[PDB]
């Protein structure tokens, strides 16, 4: 289906002397594939996916050198922003960046991405045209005007439509066996008697990959909207995900309710109900 590549970068300024921490995390199809952390004893980009071992020592040295430069760029940028917002001198602040590309099933570029956050809030974003900028506030407009003047979008557009797409094509080929793999959810219904002659019916979906899933509860083939409790999709910690959806039903009427699980990894949507033990 569709593909993506992202680099999630964070620079955190620390109290007084200790110098900012710089972290860069690379993703291919929402899965971590590389990581750099300035706090490491020997800071370098390291493989985080087994298919990344295919890259020679030169890839890692080049990537590490880019991170060393990025760390310095974020130091200067954090200082400039401190002066725009007048928090000025030596406090604890965050600067974040997201960049990358989205590809179609035909591997053609759908969209380029470039965004910044200061203190976890939107600061400046490159528009979908990859030519113009949207600043979030007055201080970010100083950055926008600086970047409009120096034609910064042009070099970002070149990476996003070029190297970003080119390297993602390479990674998709090298990690083909891994990236194409789906893990089907294993579903079951739990039964939790409560007050007023009612029972909670909980439909669990476990062991699935990717995280994208839909769990629906129906009363005699009719969808149940706001009356349904859901947990946010959560990692199992083994590469798979979990999710559950529950409904409060009257005791004795459990067989009128059905749960359906929709996942790209499934041969067809699952249909299940409370299976009482004998």
């Amino acid at each position: 289906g569709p593909h993506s590549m992202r680099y999630f970068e964070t620079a955190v300024s620390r109290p007084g002397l200790e110098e900012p921490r710089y972290i860069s995390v690379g993703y291919v199809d929402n899965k971590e594939f590389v990581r750099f952390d300035s706090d490491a004893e020997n800071p370098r980009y390291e493989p985080r996916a087994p298919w990344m071992e295919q890259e020679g020592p030169e890839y890692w040295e080049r990537e590490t050198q880019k991170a060393k430069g990025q760390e310095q760029w974020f130091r200067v940028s954090l200082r400039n922003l401190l002066g725009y917002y007048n928090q000025s001198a030596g406090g604890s602040h965050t600067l974040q960046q997201m960049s990358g590309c989205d590809l179609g099933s035909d591997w053609r570029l759908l969209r380029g991405y470039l965004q910044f956050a200061y203190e976890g809030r939107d600061y400046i974003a490159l528009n979908e045209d990859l030519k113009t900028w949207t600043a979030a506030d007055m201080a970010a407009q100083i950055t926008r005007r600086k970047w409009e003047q120096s034609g910064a979008a042009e070099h970002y557009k070149a990476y996003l439509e070029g190297e970003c797409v080119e390297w993602l094509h390479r990674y998709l080929k090298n990690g083909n066996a891994t990236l194409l793999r789906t893990d089907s959810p294993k579903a079951h219904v739990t039964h939790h008697p409560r007050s007023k002659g009612e029972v909670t019916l909980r439909c669990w979906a476990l062991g699935f990959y990717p995280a994208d899933i839909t769990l629906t509860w129906q009363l005699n083939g009719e969808e149940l909207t706001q009356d349904m409790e859901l947990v946010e999709t959560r990692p199992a910690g083994d590469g798979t995900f979990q999710k559950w959806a529950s409904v409060v039903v009257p005791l004795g009427k459990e067989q009128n309710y059905t749960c359906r699980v929709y996942h790209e990894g499934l041969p067809e949507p699952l249909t299940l109900r409370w299976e009482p033990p004998p």
Partner: peptide, 9 residues
Amino acid sequence: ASNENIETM
């Protein structure tokens, strides 16, 4: 592969 920023903020 990662991108390098040039012009600072």
